[PDB]
């Protein structure tokens, strides 16, 4: 039951960049369905197709797969999509693909919820999807804020609480991320009691580990000590690790030894 395009309206708009799936090259160009959009076939003419003149056009089409696209004019009376392939910026193609991955990945969870609760995908989209794409500009960042901050659905009417809690499980299972921040600290100590200092320094550092983010000063070498941290929001790890740095500097500046930093906190 694949339908219900990601965007607002039931026909694509004008002068926008999309991405199609290619099916046929019969006489004049590609009449192609849209996976950036619902189901509607759109035209590209072979003149609106090839930047370089070609011997066999098929090498640039590769029927069956997905390709960059631009809708210029839309027949908003009975349905026609004036579309082209070459009418896209060299860089903005990657914007088109990344937009498509966001939209497609949003579609996957909604399809899962629809095939579980047997609500047509259009209803789940209507209740949930576009209010999210309106509050936050996209449903993907809406899901990203929902995994961390549960205020996202506050003010959105769901068909049922079952759809809600199931999709919360699905966002916590599929959209699960925490970037590994790493540091490397040198011990340059030439002092007398250094091993006990190192033990106490790691005691202090690992005593900073919070429930969600655990800091473990693992050993790889005598000088080089590694700081591994799961930065869940990519901002607490650096301050945790700076606190660790200060703790080792504290332990080291009084026993008699010296220590130095090689790799500061980086994602």
């Amino acid at each position: 039951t694949s339908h219900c395009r990601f965007y607002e309206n039931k026909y694509p708009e004008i002068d926008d960049i999309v991405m199609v799936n290619v099916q046929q090259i019969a006489e004049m160009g590609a009449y192609v369905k849209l996976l950036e959009y619902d189901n509607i076939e759109g035209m590209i003419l072979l003149s609106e197709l090839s930047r370089r003149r070609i011997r066999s056009i098929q090498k640039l089409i590769r029927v069956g797969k997905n390709d960059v696209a631009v809708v210029l004019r839309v027949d908003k009376e009975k349905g026609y999509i004036d579309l082209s392939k070459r009418r896209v910026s060299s860089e903005d193609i990657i914007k088109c693909e990344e937009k498509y991955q966001k939209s497609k990945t949003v579609h996957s969870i909604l399809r899962y919820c629809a095939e579980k609760f047997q609500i047509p995908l259009e209803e789940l989209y209507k209740t949930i999807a576009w209010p999210l794409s309106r509050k936050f500009g996209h449903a993907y960042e809406a899901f990203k804020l929902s995994i961390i901050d549960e205020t996202v659905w506050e003010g959105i009417e769901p068909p049922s609480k079952d759809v809600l809690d199931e999709l919360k499980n699905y966002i916590s299972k599929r959209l699960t991320p925490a970037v590994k921040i790493r540091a490397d600290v040198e011990v340059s100590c030439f002092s007398y009691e250094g091993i006990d200092a190192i033990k106490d320094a790691l005691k202090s550092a690992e005593d900073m580990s919070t429930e969600q983010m655990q800091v473990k000063v693992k050993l790889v070498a005598a000088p080089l000590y590694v700081l591994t941290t799961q930065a869940l929001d990519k901002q607490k790890g650096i301050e945790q690790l700076e606190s660790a740095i200060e703790k080792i500097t504290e332990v080291i500046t009084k026993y008699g030894g010296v220590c130095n930093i090689t790799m500061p906190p980086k994602a």
């Binding site: 250094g194 091993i195 190192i198 033990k199 005691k203 693992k218 050993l219 005598a222």
Partner: peptide, 16 residues
């Protein structure tokens, strides 16, 4: 000979 068994947690270490 530094005695720092890598992979092991530092709370269980040994001198130089």
């Amino acid at each position: 000979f530094d005695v720092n068994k890598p992979g092991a947690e530092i709370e269980d270490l040994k001198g130089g």
